Amino acid sequence: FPELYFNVDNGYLEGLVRGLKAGVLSQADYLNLVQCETLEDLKLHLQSTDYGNFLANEASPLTVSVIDDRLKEKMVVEFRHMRNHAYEPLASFLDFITYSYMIDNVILLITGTLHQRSIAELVPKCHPLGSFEQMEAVNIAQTPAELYNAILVDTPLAAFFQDCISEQDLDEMNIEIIRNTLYKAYLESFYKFCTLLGGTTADAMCPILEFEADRRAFIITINSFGTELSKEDRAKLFPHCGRLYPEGLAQLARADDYEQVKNVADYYPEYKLLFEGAGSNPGDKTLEDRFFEHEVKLNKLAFLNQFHFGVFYAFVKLKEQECRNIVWIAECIAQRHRAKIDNYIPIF
Amino acid sequence: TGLVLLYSGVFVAFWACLLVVGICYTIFDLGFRFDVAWFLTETSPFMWSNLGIGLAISLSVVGAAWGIYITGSSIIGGGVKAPRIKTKNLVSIIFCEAVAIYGIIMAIVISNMAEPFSATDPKAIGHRNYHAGYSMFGAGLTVGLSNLFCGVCVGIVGSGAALADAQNPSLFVKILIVEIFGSAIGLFGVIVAILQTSRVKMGD
Amino acid sequence: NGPEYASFFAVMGASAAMVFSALGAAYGTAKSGTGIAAMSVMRPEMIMKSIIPVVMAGIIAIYGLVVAVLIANSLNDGISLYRSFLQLGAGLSVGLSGLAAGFAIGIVGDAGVRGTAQQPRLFVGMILILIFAEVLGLYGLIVALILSTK
Amino acid sequence: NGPEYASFFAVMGASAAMVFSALGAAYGTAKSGTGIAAMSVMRPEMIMKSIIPVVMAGIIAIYGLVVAVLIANSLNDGISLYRSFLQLGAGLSVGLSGLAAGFAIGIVGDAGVRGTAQQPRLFVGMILILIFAEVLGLYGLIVALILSTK
Amino acid sequence: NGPEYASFFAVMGASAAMVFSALGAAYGTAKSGTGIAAMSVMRPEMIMKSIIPVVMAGIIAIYGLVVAVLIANSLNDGISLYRSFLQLGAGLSVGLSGLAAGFAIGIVGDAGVRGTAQQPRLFVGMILILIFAEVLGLYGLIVALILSTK
Amino acid sequence: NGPEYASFFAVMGASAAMVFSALGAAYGTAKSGTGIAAMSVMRPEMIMKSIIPVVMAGIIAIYGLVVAVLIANSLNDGISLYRSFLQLGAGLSVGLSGLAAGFAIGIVGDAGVRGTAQQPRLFVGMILILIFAEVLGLYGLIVALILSTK
Amino acid sequence: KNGPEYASFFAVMGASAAMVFSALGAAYGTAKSGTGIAAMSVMRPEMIMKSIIPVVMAGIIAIYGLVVAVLIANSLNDGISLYRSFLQLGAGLSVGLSGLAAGFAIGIVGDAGVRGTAQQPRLFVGMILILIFAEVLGLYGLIVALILSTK
Amino acid sequence: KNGPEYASFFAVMGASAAMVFSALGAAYGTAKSGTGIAAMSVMRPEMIMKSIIPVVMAGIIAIYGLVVAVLIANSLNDGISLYRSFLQLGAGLSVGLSGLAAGFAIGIVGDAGVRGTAQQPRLFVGMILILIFAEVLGLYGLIVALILSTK
Amino acid sequence: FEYPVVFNLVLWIMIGLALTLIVTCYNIWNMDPGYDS
Amino acid sequence: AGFFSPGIWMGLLTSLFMLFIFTYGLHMILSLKTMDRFD
Ligand SMILES: CO/C1=C/C(C)=C\[C@@H](C)[C@@H](O)[C@H](C)C/C(C)=C/C=C/[C@H](OC)[C@@H]([C@@H](C)[C@@H](O)[C@H](C)[C@@]2(O)C[C@@H](O)[C@H](C)[C@@H](C(C)C)O2)OC1=O
Ligand SMILES: CO/C1=C\C(C)=C/[C@@H](C)[C@@H](O)[C@H](C)C/C(C)=C/C=C/[C@H](OC)[C@@H]([C@@H](C)[C@@H](O)[C@H](C)[C@@]2(O)C[C@@H](O)[C@H](C)[C@@H](C(C)C)O2)OC1=O
Ligand SMILES: CO/C1=C\C(C)=C/[C@@H](C)[C@@H](O)[C@H](C)C/C(C)=C\C=C\[C@H](OC)[C@@H]([C@@H](C)[C@@H](O)[C@H](C)[C@@]2(O)C[C@@H](O)[C@H](C)[C@@H](C(C)C)O2)OC1=O
Ligand SMILES: CO/C1=C\C(C)=C\[C@@H](C)[C@@H](O)[C@H](C)C/C(C)=C/C=C/[C@H](OC)[C@@H]([C@@H](C)[C@@H](O)[C@H](C)[C@@]2(O)C[C@@H](O)[C@H](C)[C@@H](C(C)C)O2)OC1=O
Ligand SMILES: CO/C1=C\C(C)=C\[C@@H](C)[C@@H](O)[C@H](C)C/C(C)=C/C=C\[C@H](OC)[C@@H]([C@@H](C)[C@@H](O)[C@H](C)[C@@]2(O)C[C@@H](O)[C@H](C)[C@@H](C(C)C)O2)OC1=O
Ligand SMILES: CCCCCCCC/C=C\CCCCCCCC(=O)O
């Protein structure tokens, strides 16, 4: 019933984004990258993939800050191509992927405002996916975050700012409480939008958005032990989206200890066996290196369905792992510290 | 849903009005005014005969073209990165093109059996010209709808097989078996359609 | 014999026994065949062992052809109105129950061959649920053979 | 005796007892069959004991099979219009309530084997809710056996 | 005696009492059955105590059964049109009010059982609201009894 | 006396007085009863204080029961067409006006008990709104008693 | 010989439906696959005139319905038999609903084709070979309407 | 010879439906492609008067229906035969619903065409070539309405 | 004698002018002008 | 007289059939929405 339609508007773009799956590096592509000894030789072993001739114009001294910036500018021009050819049931979905980067850029645009800076932080120091090159009133808003917050409501992040009054970001709230309260309102609005689009895109995507609400339920309550934010301050940072919602979030707001978040993940047998990072050992994978193996395990499962929108969000989050894996191979090669070079995630 | 509210607003108001009318023909004894006999016999058998030829070919090429654009967006969409698809994956197009061959064959086999008569009385028009009228309607419906369902069935499998050929080129000859079982549904509608109009002769 | 309009209901019993059981066989092949072609890129070895949800949807197609040949050969010029209502009710009973047995093969056969590509322990459990969804079309056949052969 | 179109309502009770109970047994098999393939990727031991929500959906189909054989074997040409209305309501009673019972087995059998994967203590509780959703097909059977055998 | 179409309105009271109370009893068992599987994963002690909102939904199943047997045992060949209309409005009044009582049980039984996982004092208050949604099916029972027995 | 079909419109006033006031009382106890569960997590004290929207939604159900007993006791074999038109409009006047009043109780009773979770000053104001949504069923009662007892 | 007075309703309803339902299919294949021209025009402006084939092949769909609807409007006659007028209703549904659906597939493949040709130019002979198979479908409805209307 | 009393209903419907549905297509071509002129105006204001071509193409769709609403209303008599008024019912539908389709195709191509001309001036020779194909869909409905109204 | 003519002339107009009226008043009721400023 | 004559039932089963063909062919053209941006 969503299969006999959906090739009307989104049939060419789905076959395109599955053609970009075939360019995601396999295990045998990674095993030829870990044999490289210099970043000059990593330029050679990357040319046998579909990345080829992307570092051919930079410099003869090839540093790791150029490879990282040239890898992620290739994911932008692949995402901007699939957005400029998108139709309105899919273009509303592709704009919801960029709100995770518009949130990370709005917060970067108010730290310069509280410290009296300008557009000099905008162009070089923001992610190109969530980018402000339109809404040009943001680009000249030198006002101290009061006549500027009245311009951020002329931006697609306006519907998320209904829990942040312009007096709260005016030195009243910490800069990470403004992040995660927007990201709480972002995931809960993206979970409802992915439920209105029913059928195949609501059962291949809501398992991904349930785990994203349980990563930030576990990682927030673990990093909130030594710091000064109360239990009522992190209970409003939990997104009400995941599997943990009525019961786990009641216990996670009362934890105060790492052993009290381990026995609330024991109730859920998918989250236990993920809590066996166990960083008391010197060399092994930590907790977030085991949460990244589960983020990309659910993202590979979105390509097992066909007629759905979840094939596009599971490509951006697997081309982001390419910009994290190849840089990690390049950062263990340039430093010649390649005993932990196998601590990447072998996606395909 | 904006426009589906209109299609469900008419479908509810049609059957709620047939619920009220249906419990008012029986309830004050006017059953005799319904007369499904008078509907089937005073409507011309040339109307049922030409809704059989009109739906044998047109509802086949609805499903023949519904199956082409489902998998033809996966040839050109999947063949941008891997352009070796466009010559091997054309037999998915042919398997939903052949379901319109069964339409145009079974539309000119049925059309050879319709011949004019001159009678107007439902006793003068016997139950051979009425059986020939109903069997041409029911044979263009079982070859038009069974090819409308077969043509989209070999388009959805053909669109999935064109996106598996993009990753591994060795997989297409094994998912071709699924399009064989799907294209046998259209041939099963032709077998029933030649048996509904086997002993049919129209005219006087 | 019967009235002049009597052969309208036996014709719609041979049409609806094949049309409604083609829609079940087309859904059972297209919904599960979507799952075959997508699991095959990650597991190209079980691509032939997982065809059997599409050959079980094809039995639903030949469940409707057995009765649509049986009706369209026993139908003559001027049958009784009792015998044409029997073959109408024998046409809807295998068609619309083959449409249900073709839906429950499509939804099970799609989810079964995804859970088999992730874990091969499901294959004996997948072809056991697929018998329960395929005898729904057999129950409609053995009551369309009772109704038509009266 | 009765009219000739009296057998129309008597074969719409043999049809609707089989098509509405197969459309209920399809929803109990398909919707709860995705729940098996979603829980067996983590718990492959509880596969053969999770066939109970699709076994109990298969008894809903054979409830409608029994009534559609009782109606079709009590058919004659020229039956009365009173006995024809009894078998129409005997098809709608075991049909449309078996469809209601198949709607409920499909919902609590899908969601039951999701909670049984997260906790092995729900297996006795899920079975008790499956009993309450399978006597709805049994209540429709004992009204179909009362109405058709008058 | 009554006309030949008169028995159609009495069988459609025996059928509409059964299939509309079963649709209410299915919605009370399905929606408040998924509330059990979402509650038990943190508090598995109150599983058997949470069978009450699917027990109270199961009494609506037999509110329609006891008049579907009561109407089908007062059926006669040639009942009057006034006697036949009383049993139509006795089936439509315990069905569509039992469908309402099952609609309200499945909403407050699902939200209530999810509410007692984090607050155990709600269970004596949830069971009190379920009484109020139960008697909506009982008010339709005592008005279907004074209509059939006339 | 009157015609033979005359008792149809009085039975559809006895049943519409019940099934539309039971749908209003269903929406009254289910929409407000899902607000008691959200109030209970932070304020478990005022659980018994919050059954008042559920109690006053059950008053709407007994408004429709009184008229439905009053109509079903005013039935005879062969009433006039004028008398049975009076009781059709007496069933809609308490059914479809109890469906409005029960819809209004379920909406303000839901927001009222979620507003008294955060401020108990609304509790004396929540009950005062619900009397205004109570008398809409009472106004429908006293026009149903006027129409039926003529 | 003279039929009923309403007999010529069904032939004009076939001459209308042969032109109306073909113009709806020709307007879908022009509007959908003309939207795809403007998306590939911004980056690859040299392939504009080469990619007007999916609005040319959707224009032959409309002249399939014009040929039938002229033959029905010329075979119309006062007092046609009821047999001859239903022959041209079935001739209007045979080329009407054919050109409606064949003009849909030229729109979807033509919009997906001119966007995948502007990036991979090897797909141009593969796009036109699918559009051919979606254009003979409009000709299967034509040559079965020429049989029915001239029967 | 004389027609019945209700016979003039179907010919005054084809007079209205030739004007109703061709003005409903000409209004969709003016609205959907007039939304695109205001989008290209904010950056490229020299191409305003040159981009009125997609709304003068939809203006010819409106006068296709005006001509045959005059050709039908001047062929009306009291007591026209039922055949002579059924001809002017399908002569009204085959030009109203053809101009309705040809107005949906003008307004969609005229929207994407004048927004792509703002970013690529080489598309203007291509957009005006597609609008010829989307305007003759109303012309094919005109020459089948004239061949039906006259007889 | 022309009762089936006048019945179908009134019925298929007054639900052709009601569906045209309902669809029109549905689109003006749900207009969405855009209003924050 | 009756509500329907046999000439109306043939003309109504034809008009209300190709009204279903028209609103299938108009629902598809009411949903061929264009793009917002260009590159
Ligand atoms: C006042 O005339 C108008 C007349 C109207 C209402 C109706 C009919 C004439 C028309 O319905 C007929 C059918 C078509 C036709 C032939 C129209 C001429 C229109 C005018 O003329 C183009 C333009 C006029 C704006 C146009 O003329 C521009 C001034 C322009 O000159 C700018 C050119 O750069 C542009 C390319 C060129 C093209 C569009 C013809 O015309 O408007 C008008 O209101
Ligand atoms: C097995 O046949 C049961 C029901 C069946 C088959 C059929 C119908 C006839 C039913 O339609 C009717 C209504 C009978 C019915 C509903 C009886 C109450 C029965 C038992 O009585 C709880 C519980 C049973 C689940 C019981 O074992 C529960 C565990 C429990 O007892 C645990 C208690 O802690 C909890 C408080 C208690 C409540 C309601 C008193 O439910 O059902 C059954 O046995
Ligand atoms: C001007 O309007 C044209 C025709 C019009 C107005 C009217 C009807 C008869 C027409 O409505 C119908 C649709 C005629 C029809 C069914 C095809 C006619 C096609 C022309 O004959 C290719 C092309 C085509 C020649 C031309 O438009 C392009 C220049 C081009 O030729 C350039 C080539 O490089 C490109 C390869 C080529 C395709 C056709 C092979 O298109 O246009 C036209 O003249
Ligand atoms: C595959 O079709 C099989 C039989 C068919 C077609 C039965 C129909 C006529 C059915 O229409 C109806 C329901 C009757 C019914 C009742 C069948 C039970 C069947 C089998 O059950 C013995 C299953 C099979 C599920 C069962 O045998 C499992 C192996 C198992 O034994 C595993 C046990 O661990 C599990 C607890 C036990 C319970 C669930 C019954 O089932 O096999 C079969 O051959
Ligand atoms: C037997 O079923 C109960 C009532 C039923 C079914 C009534 C039907 C016959 C119905 O037709 C109506 C509603 C009769 C009616 C109108 C009862 C009103 C209150 C009941 O009382 C009498 C409450 C009430 C005792 C109790 O349930 C509450 C705990 C409370 O006592 C505690 C107080 O804090 C609370 C504020 C007060 C309010 C809500 C009245 O009631 O209970 C019941 O058991
Ligand atoms: C006897 C005549 C009755 C039939 C006439 C039907 C003609 C319908 C005409 C116009 C209806 C279209 C109104 C809807 C406007 C669409 C709004 C939009 O799409 O933006």
Residue numbers in the entry:
A (entry chain d): 4 to 351
B (entry chain b): 2 to 205
C (entry chain c), D (entry chain g), E (entry chain k), F (entry chain l): 6 to 155
G (entry chain q), H (entry chain p): 5 to 155
I (entry chain r): 302 to 338
J (entry chain s): 417 to 455
From the paper:
The vacuolar-type H+-ATPases (V-ATPases), which are ATP-driven proton pumps responsible for modulating intracellular and extracellular pH, are involved in many physiological processes, ranging from membrane trafficking and autophagy to apoptosis, bone resorption, and sperm maturation. Bafilomycin A1, a member of macrolide antibiotics and an autophagy inhibitor, serves as a specific and potent V-ATPases inhibitor. The V1 and Vo domains of V-ATPase can assemble and disassemble in vivo depending on various stimuli, such as growth factors, amino acid starvation, and increased glucose concentration; therefore, the V-ATPase activity can be shut down and turned on like a switch. ATP hydrolysis by the V1 domain can trigger rotation of the Vo domain, facilitating proton transport through the cavity between subunit a and c-ring.
Here, we report the cryo-EM structure of bafilomycin A1 bound intact bovine V-ATPase at an overall resolution of 3.6-Å. Six bafilomycin A1 molecules are found in the cytosolic leaflet of the c-ring. The nine subunits c along with one subunit c″ constitute the c-ring of Vo domain: remarkably, each bafilomycin A1 binds to two adjacent subunits c including c1c2, c2c3, c5c6, c6c7, c7c8, and c8c9. As the binding sites in c3c4 and c4c5 have been blocked by subunit a, bafilomycin A1 is not able to bind these two sites. The transmembrane helix 2 (TM2) of one subunit c and the TM4 of the neighboring subunit c create a composite binding site, accounting for how two subunits c engage one bafilomycin A1 molecule. Residue M53, I56, V60, and I67 of one subunit c contribute hydrophobic contacts with bafilomycin A1, while the other subunit c forms ligand contacts through L133, F137, V140, and Y144. Importantly, the hydroxyl group of Y144 forms a hydrogen bond with the 7′-hydroxyl group of bafilomycin A1. Y144 of subunit c aligns with F189 in subunit c″ and hence is not conserved. These findings explain why the site between subunit c″ and subunit c9 is not utilized for bafilomycin A1 binding. When the c-ring rotates, bafilomycin A1 could provide steric hindrance to prevent the interactions between subunit a and c-ring, thereby blocking proton translocation.
